[PDB]
Amino acid sequence: WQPPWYCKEPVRIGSCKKQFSSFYFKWTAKKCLPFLFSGCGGNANRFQTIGECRKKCLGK
């Protein structure tokens, strides 16, 4: 692994009055940080558990 898209890909929440759990891979950290996603306006840097986290941005 060498870093592709995901790691440097921006965190987006969206805007509607319910939030679902998410993790984004933080590029200057080297691990995933938690947030919550609303639904109405995200991207694709969102790992559903912290075990999916490492498969896009570490080579594991």
Swiss-Prot record:
Annotated InterPro entries: Kunitz_BPTI, Kunitz_BPTI_sf, Prtase_inh_Kunz-CS, TFPI/VKTCI-like
GO cellular component, one term: extracellular space
Keyword Secreted attributed: yes
Protein's name in the database: Kunitz-type serine protease inhibitor homolog calcicludine
Keywords: Calcium channel impairing toxin, Cardiotoxin, Disulfide bond, Ion channel impairing toxin, Neurotoxin, Secreted, Toxin
Compartment(s) of residence: Secreted
Annotated disulfide bonds: C7-C57, C16-C40, C32-C53
Molecular functions per Gene Ontology: calcium channel regulator activity; serine-type endopeptidase inhibitor activity; toxin activity
Residue span(s) of domain BPTI/Kunitz inhibitor: 7-57
Tissue specificity annotation: Expressed by the venom gland.
Superkingdom field: Eukaryota
Native source species: Dendroaspis angusticeps
Family: Belongs to the venom Kunitz-type family.
SUPFAM superfamilies hit by this protein: BPTI-like (SSF57362)
Protein function: Potent blocker of high-voltage-activated calcium ion channels in the nanomolar range, particularly the L-type channels in cerebellar granule cells. The sensitivity of L-, N- and P-type channels to CAC is tissue and species-dependent. Blocks the L-type current of cardiac cells, depressing cardiac contractility.
Annotated signal sequence range: none
